[PDB]
Structure 1
């Protein structure tokens, strides 16, 4: 009774099997059953994603503050970042534009707790800007609030790279040993991470088994409404940005696609900016780009500059809002712009943590995942991430290929 299988199908057959199993259960008779039996395995999966973050988000971002230690020369790739921001900023814009045309979410009245979502109005920015600084990092980290457990983790690890340097030898030996422990927790988390991706097949099955039992069936159409709103928005900015800003330069925008070939192919199948990096790296070499340019910019387009993930989140948010029976207002709309950018700037680049960074793009713009109406809707859109992750990644990689080819004009 054994586990072996390439998981990113295991989940996807979990999904299509879940969808097809779900629909046929609630229809035929026992609309309940699944709520009492199956859902509790989705409830499980959910929890395990959350079990992560806090350690991962601490540990990782202490490492990624020893990784970047001044000198951290952002004095020649000013050009590339300036570009990356605008594309990602325009991507989420385009997502909100696509979540206008299509209205995913509406046509579902999620009541969950015998009671629909009421939106609790945001506190002043004074008070939230100040509550990036923890009053006690341990507390902040502990009970769970994250935006201090960023500001601390960074300010610890940025300060730690001035201790390995310090005059004293034994102080540098102390600074090291702490960082050598924090890192490794980072890794140990990543070892459990993979193991959660091994329960992910069960998890996803149980989620969109429940959704398709309780609340049929033009919820299918609704989630397929997302699929399009995402997809013919993704492909709607490949034409509207890349094919545009390359043409309006002088670079050949059409044959660019042909010598990006397999950096594009894999991005869709691997669904990873990690896997599609020695492939995107080679592809820049293969279309004949200069070393110090693509050698610095394509690894910075890896973690920074997720164009598709910014757009994906700018749709998912809208989906949730309307699914709750909440008319998502303007300003909030352009907060989502600035939030989804500042999420899809820190999103992972593996498979999952696009959706599990959307997490916070919802927490911002009063829509927290504590409210069960929110969460049960999040469960839906996180359920079908496995579809809109493979499709999404393809752009995240192409957007920093195009930037690397646009900036290749500097001599």
Structure 2
């Protein structure tokens, strides 16, 4: 139950990727899934477990911070933060999708040539039963309640009554008891993270690694180096320009990125994601409201993956893609689900949904054919997109934090 720290993870990752990629090439991809996968799941299981307390509890406490600003500000900032990162991510994806040209081996052209309310999703933010909210998953209505509770607690402490001021403290302390308690567990889990990481990208490399070959591999290039370029050229440029030291950042954010990459789930890593912001030294009044509202509002990933994948399809059915009018489709994709990009496999869904809009429906058996290739590579393209999202989540936090 001992041994080296987060190199133990990197030992799992590299050793897993190799042993999986090998094992699936020789076809045992199924056998890897029935024997290895469940140790990879038990890691994501334990992390999921925490996500509800550790957010709810942390954000009641995180409304002990100055409520009118801080939770009125920052929200305004961190919103506008993602606007100007996602903008850069879009043009970094397009200019990666021209750089690599994934549409040469297919080359197989088929003609063609050719509903969200929002208001009934805005009203969903406000839960009608916070107990159920928590119980039955749900991040973005639990966010709204916790903020509204901790603000209300703040106001109870300033009550001239001192039974009220009394109990007010009791609750908020007891809630912070939980909040803290969960961060304690998040390391208990992390001691199983090398087993978890090894077992996860063992399977994910067996069952979708072999596919990363040929013209399919030419999308994985323009994703993986396309986001590698989002880290270095967009985030570090923002960390440099806002004090906070770029390399000291990766130092602290090591474990949140290696979990985001492997769990492939934005929200499913928030316990680790948040604990890195504690140990980094941000206050709960920020990170408890910018790391969850990040996981569900962040578009850096989907803007960069449905920039190069939108190209692949448009170019594989042998189309112009209105080069430099890529954006018209890439922007409208992001904007169709600005929010709710946290779920794993979500990228594939919007990509399909765009085709409904493009006019090329998934029925057209060659549209469906090309799309199915992306689907044989989606998991690899999902890992990188989430890891670059949760890097972008902490970058957004640590910059806004080191302001307000």
> What's the offset of the Cα at 1:367?
3.6
In 1, Cα distance between equivalents of 2:140 and 2:271: 32
Residues 64-100 of structure 1: CA deviation (Å, up to 9, x unaligned) = 9999999997554100010112211211211111001
> What's the offset of the Cα at 1:237?
1.2
8 Å CA contact retained: 1:362, 1:369: yes
In angstroms, what is the RMSD of aligned CA positions?
Answer: 9.4
> What's the offset of the Cα at 1:220?
3.1
Which residue does 1:401 correspond to in 2? 394
Closer, same or farther in 2 for the Cα pair 1:15/1:214, shift >3 Å? same
Closer, same or farther in 2 for the Cα pair 1:308/1:199, shift >3 Å? same
Closer, same or farther in 2 for the Cα pair 1:203/1:224, shift >3 Å? farther
Closer, same or farther in 2 for the Cα pair 1:62/1:287, shift >3 Å? closer
> What's the offset of the Cα at 1:340?
3.2
Moved more, 75-84 or 140-149: 140-149
Closer, same or farther in 2 for the Cα pair 1:77/1:24, shift >3 Å? closer
Query: SS state of the match for residue 152, structure 2?
Result: helix
8 Å CA contact retained: 2:92, 2:226: yes
In 2, Cα distance between equivalents of 1:357 and 1:196: 33
Closer, same or farther in 2 for the Cα pair 1:394/1:235, shift >3 Å? same
- How high is the TM-score relative to the length of structure 1? 0.58
In 2, Cα distance between equivalents of 1:312 and 1:303: 17
Residues 345-377 of structure 1: CA deviation (Å, up to 9, x unaligned) = 234423211211222233334443233222211
8 Å CA contact retained: 1:92, 1:314: yes
Residues 249-268 of structure 1: CA deviation (Å, up to 9, x unaligned) = 22211110000010011111
Aligned residues: 404
> What's the offset of the Cα at 1:387?
1.2
8 Å CA contact retained: 1:320, 1:378: yes
In 2, Cα distance between equivalents of 1:282 and 1:45: 16
Say which of 43, 46, 52 aligns to 1:45.
43
8 Å CA contact retained: 1:42, 1:203: yes
Which residue does 2:82 correspond to in 1? 84
In 2, Cα distance between equivalents of 1:267 and 1:245: 21
The runs of 5 or more residues in structure 1 that have no matched partner are: 117-121
Query: SS state of the match for residue 33, structure 1?
Result: helix
8 Å CA contact retained: 2:204, 2:380: no
Closer, same or farther in 2 for the Cα pair 1:44/1:81, shift >3 Å? closer
In 1, Cα distance between equivalents of 2:213 and 2:60: 42
> What's the offset of the Cα at 1:292?
0.7
> What's the offset of the Cα at 1:280?
0.3
Closer, same or farther in 2 for the Cα pair 1:155/1:283, shift >3 Å? closer
Write 1 or 2 for the structure with the bigger share of helix. 2
Residues 4-38 of structure 1: CA deviation (Å, up to 9, x unaligned) = 99999999999999999999999999999999999
Moved more, 336-345 or 396-405: 336-345
Closer, same or farther in 2 for the Cα pair 1:164/1:380, shift >3 Å? farther
Closer, same or farther in 2 for the Cα pair 1:78/1:97, shift >3 Å? same
8 Å CA contact retained: 2:103, 2:316: yes
Residues 281-316 of structure 1: CA deviation (Å, up to 9, x unaligned) = 110001001111111101111111131221011110
Closer, same or farther in 2 for the Cα pair 1:147/1:173, shift >3 Å? same
- How high is the TM-score relative to the length of structure 2? 0.59
Closer, same or farther in 2 for the Cα pair 1:180/1:266, shift >3 Å? closer
In 2, Cα distance between equivalents of 1:194 and 1:376: 44
Residues 189-232 of structure 1: CA deviation (Å, up to 9, x unaligned) = 99999999999999999999999999999993211111111101
8 Å CA contact retained: 1:306, 1:397: no
In 1, Cα distance between equivalents of 2:113 and 2:204: 18
8 Å CA contact retained: 1:306, 1:396: yes
Closer, same or farther in 2 for the Cα pair 1:289/1:312, shift >3 Å? same
Query: SS state of the match for residue 62, structure 2?
Result: helix
Closer, same or farther in 2 for the Cα pair 1:132/1:98, shift >3 Å? farther
In 2, Cα distance between equivalents of 1:375 and 1:398: 33
The runs of 5 or more residues in structure 2 that have no matched partner are: none
8 Å CA contact retained: 1:313, 1:361: no
In 2, Cα distance between equivalents of 1:188 and 1:376: 49
1:268 and 2:273 are equivalent in the alignment: no
Closer, same or farther in 2 for the Cα pair 1:213/1:309, shift >3 Å? closer
Moved more, 205-214 or 310-319: 205-214
8 Å CA contact retained: 2:286, 2:401: yes
